[PDB]
């Protein structure tokens with residue numbers, strides 16, 4: 247019993263973290279096989295960052311300009327190329343600690359574990375959700391770029407995120423491991439804004455099943471609702487429309503607890519219009535949308 | 548920028564997790580050098596657990612009765628002994644992945660990272676605080692016993708906790724890595740109760756410094772207070788007395804932000820008597836006491 251914001255065991259990813267230094271700039275890199283992946287603003291000076299021309303900056307660099315360090319060992323760079331906003335540095339040594347891996351592009355609403363690094367040294371691990379406006383509510387200081395977001399399926403590490411920037415609102419933005427940003431952001435030091443964020447409805451309902459599995463069941467009411475009547479009520483609260491695909495994903499939890507998805511929508515509909523009346527759910531006073539149905543099935547089954 | 552409940556990178560501990568099976572019972576073990584540490588109720592049947600005599604159960608066992616598995620490899624047990632509520636099994640192979648380590652007894656109020664395991668396989672990592680009533684608010688299913696709590700000082704793993712039980716209230720109890728329970732609990736399946744829990748005052752103030760470092764500063768008032776006048780007001784809210792030792796520990800944060808500890812106590816005193824008036828601090832609607840001053844200095848400096 248018990249429900250906690252859990253992160254994946256980061257050990258497989260720790261063995262891949264390297265420190266990439268170019269000129270005076272130092273950030274983190276992901277060393278998988280004979281290639282190191284890192285944000286392309288490692289080739290920037292502080293003056294360059296206000297408006298950089300990464301293609302112009304990179305042509306002026308050679309393999310020896312990049313200082314890659316794996317612990318105390320310096321890895322000799324034998325090739326370099328840029329894929330969108332990521333820089334790939336081929337090295338003479340393949341990582342013996344390289345786990346089984348794939349590079350995926352997560353969808354908004356899905357979660358991942360962030361392994362926060364500084365100087366190629368992991369410092370901490372925490373769980374994040376890719377918001378519908380394509381930002382994450384992380385905790386990143388200077389030098390944290392190149393810290394990656396990942397999920398673990400038994401023995402396979404699916405890397406889905408690489409840290410690049412922090413917005414004026416405090417939220418964090420980054421790319422997939424192919425260099426493509428999540429959201430309409432560019433890697434230049436200029437004022438940038440994220441779109442309107444919405445509440446991930448399927449995650450709130452999944453978190454309500456986790457609450458029932460844990461004995462918190464005061465919000466359970468006797469009514470049912472239609473998917474259409476739930477979406478009209480939830481619309482004014484900035485809740486994304488719950489689709490049939492979301493109802494299908496909620497199946498395993500609904501089968502386990504014996505509470506139909508549409509009966510749980512009627513419970514949430516009351517919580518939306520009437521509030522919590524000073525009560526808490528799973529210790530929290532606010533409804534939570536950062537736990538996906540799979541994250542709930544992971545701990546509560 | 549950003550403030551998150553962060554856990555230590557669990558990689559060093561993952562390389563120490565083994566699966567200990569005796570008879571039909573299977574739980575986790577911590578393999579450091581040539582010794583495996585595990586809860587002593589691995590030698591119990593389900594009937595034995597209501598009221599066990601572990602000394603009587605263990606004398607009936609020999610080295611071959613214990614099945615220790617490190618991945619696919621079975622470790623041959625060449626010795627066994629019981630230290631309080633932990634069982635130590637000497638093995639013929641010393642763990643090549645054993646990190647630099649020490650065994651510590653944490654104080655109430657301090658935090659640690661829990662690496663949750665099942666069948667000797669790590670499944671997740673999360674941060675816990677040892678409550679003043681000696682319980683933790685974890686998330687443990689069946690077979691999670693032997694999952695350890697730890698802190699990492701650069702390269703040294705200080706193991707401070709091992710999971711044993713879940714109380715009727717939902718909270719979790721365990722021993723240090725010497726077999727001594729935290730709190731007045733016994734490892735038998737009987738109704739057990741934890742004492743009255745209190746609010747860790749020094750952690751609330753540390754979390755208020757993290758909030759100011761992050762731009763959340765609406766609660767900052769113009770007043771100061773004495774340590775004595777703060778403790779009298781906080782007493783009725785079930786806040787533990789803030790001692791001079793706590794004020795000294797809060798020094799680094801107070802120096803960094805430029806807010807005196809006694810000025811932050813006056814801000815908290817207002818929050819205690821007047822409430823939050825519908826406002827949140829660091830996104831939370833309730834005051835938080837699970838982040839120690841060192842946890843704040845870790846991310847916010």
Ligand SMILES: *C(=N)[C@H](C[C@@H]1CCNC1=O)NC(=O)[C@@H]1[C@@H]2[C@H](CN1C(=O)[C@@H](NC(=O)C(F)(F)F)C(C)(C)C)C2(C)C
Nearest residue numbers: 287386387389390391410411412413433434435436438
């Ligand atoms: C990479 N190590 C840092 C991580 C930053 C440090 C503070 N928290 C973070 O997320 N990334 C940067 O410093 C990038 C980098 C130049 C500027 N920058 C930013 O994240 C800036 N933000 C933006 O420009 C904005 F608003 F568009 F997102 C900064 C003002 C420093 C927070 C480049 C090349 C984009």
Ligand SMILES: *C(=N)[C@H](C[C@@H]1CCNC1=O)NC(=O)[C@@H]1[C@@H]2[C@H](CN1C(=O)[C@@H](NC(=O)C(F)(F)F)C(C)(C)C)C2(C)C
Nearest residue numbers: 588687688690691692711712713714734735736737739
């Ligand atoms: C070890 N793998 C489990 C972990 C349990 C499983 C559910 N969540 C947990 O923390 N530990 C046990 O099953 C121990 C074990 C017998 C009973 N037990 C308990 O934790 C029970 N609780 C208590 O007896 C109580 F209330 F005193 F804490 C249980 C009712 C199963 C939750 C022994 C030997 C104590």
